[model samples]
Target: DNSYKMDYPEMGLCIIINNKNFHKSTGMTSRSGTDVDAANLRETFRNLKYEVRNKNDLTREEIVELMRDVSKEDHSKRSSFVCVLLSHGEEGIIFGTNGPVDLKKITNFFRGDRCRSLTGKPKLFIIQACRGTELDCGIETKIPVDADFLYAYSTAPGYYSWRNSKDGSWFIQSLCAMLKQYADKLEFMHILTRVNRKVATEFESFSFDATFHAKKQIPCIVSMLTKELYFYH
Candidate 1:
């Protein structure tokens, strides 16, 4: 009921899909550089009392059903929600069993107009996927958004994102470092800024496979937030 005043932990939920193992038809492995990063974010959300739900290695249909379920509140307004996707992606799409899923169909289900009651609150999404195999050309300037949404992507478009033969992807590691260090006090973008730095500088692989040698990446953020956000009180 509207009378039910939201408490610190009263916020709704966080769904994390650490797609370490996908259907092998895609020739993909659960062995992703994103595992550690996914775990960190999931843990952080849970520790803050977010009801966390996860669907791993499921068919795209399963994901669709799950999204449909979570995206509805038919009778009541939801508190707030966070979702993190850790997998291989290309521009404007996320992957699941069967094939590529347009991010629009997935997110449109949760839009303020679609989900009504959540109109003024934040809906956050963190994405860790490579855009393509292109290298950074260095920015002469940058762009920013003034809104309540934020999307954190692993690599720039047209670049091959890195993963570990033994460890994992560098983005997740860098992400966790920033989250752990400033999660308690820093605003989300402040933390994400560091994520940008960590990925840009602290990581670079060296190997005889020079063709796939070192790669650089930057986090992409599309923020619509009107206020600061944090998991802690």
Candidate 2:
């Protein structure tokens, strides 16, 4: 029996945020970026039989409240937990209606020490935002192994992330392509390996009037996953 399969009609909540406007800030062209990207993500998840909830244009407090309530739900008692966040962020500070808030403060709600209701459950957060201002033009050296939990970042911290005026964001497209295609069979890293490929080959940075149009960024992953995650159970 496939006990790990994600049953269709299973309830799953999705939080989509689009910050077209910030407090007196502009020039982002990021308007509607979050929702647009999330829509594609929603479609893929929906095909996998997960109920979707789209939360767009919400403030920091509002988003926190949403996460708080969601953390209380019994997702682990069910299939899996997933979330998507898109906005202008600086390292750990995600934008709010008023200003910035720490990412840890919001995600801590579901941490083992906090939300024991879903103890040992997978609480996945898909963050499509800026981290720092660093670009990876050269090859990366060998690093230690990381797994279990994961975080997918749009760009590396302090660097610019690339986006096509005609197409969309590299991160969103690459993610959808990987997860939608291999989620049922391969491990998450197998999918992320494709993400790394797409980001590496299909995207690049540009400059405008000596100002960088996009910064080079690599997605980030943080995890503590125990058993192998299988959707086709």
Candidate 3:
């Protein structure tokens, strides 16, 4: 039924994976601003009633294993799961200290049949990483149509996700800001669309290199939800 009450004192777990430093041979540099992202996300979701857990600099095997582990948790007393990944990445994959791991490997652990405890609950993911080197030339753009899962990526396909050494990622900073401001009043996608706009318009990359200077980005939302979702009813 569409009338299932979505309220619960505990909202399952919010798992945060932050991979900053990587192996030297991978030719990947450390992510500088992610610590701040991790800290802010813990506070943001904690305030929203999720049991927050933060893990840092895990290997590719460990990262995927962790999600499978989390999916095994007893979620009968909670309402949902939220995972945030802050790492170096490319299209369809997120990096661990060892190397890139396919995003699906981690997210698939929470599939309805795979994780029965959370079968009817929402699984939310927010990923802050470059999707590829390609850039979106135009900005444009679902639920139990809020039943199962959804993802919000920092940048569109083949685009660099921007971050600052001082403040953190453009997408994350905007996301935390909007979630804090609207989590109590607006529906989930409304808050994310606002996040989409905030990243697209309010920020730009700063670089001495002309090619990367003032570059633009917008978040992408992938949904597998079957119903509407609201953090607060």
The candidate that wins on lDDT is: 3
Least well predicted 10-residue stretch by lDDT in candidate 2? 140-149
| Regions of model 2 farther than 4 Å from truth | 1-11, 25-33, 135-148, 208-216
The worst-scoring run of ten residues by lDDT in candidate 1 lies at: 138-147
Give the winner by TM-score.
Answer: 3
Clashes of each: 16, 21, 10
How many angstroms is residue 111 displaced in model 2 relative to the true structure, after the best TM-score fit?
1.0
TM-score of candidate 1 to 2 decimals: 0.82
The Cα error of candidate 3 at residue 82, in Å, is 0.5
Q: Over the stretch 154-201, how does candidate 1's per-residue lDDT look in tens digits?
A: 776667667664565677677767777887777778898888888887
Q: Scored by CA lDDT, what does every candidate get?
A: 0.68, 0.65, 0.85
lDDT of 3 by residue, 8-40 (tens): 657779999999899987999888868999998
As a TM-score, model 3 comes out at: 0.92
The global Cα lDDT (0 to 1) of model 1 is 0.68
Q: Which ranges of candidate 1 are over 4 A from the true structure?
A: 1-9, 27-34, 74-79, 136-147
Candidate order by decreasing lDDT? 3, 1, 2
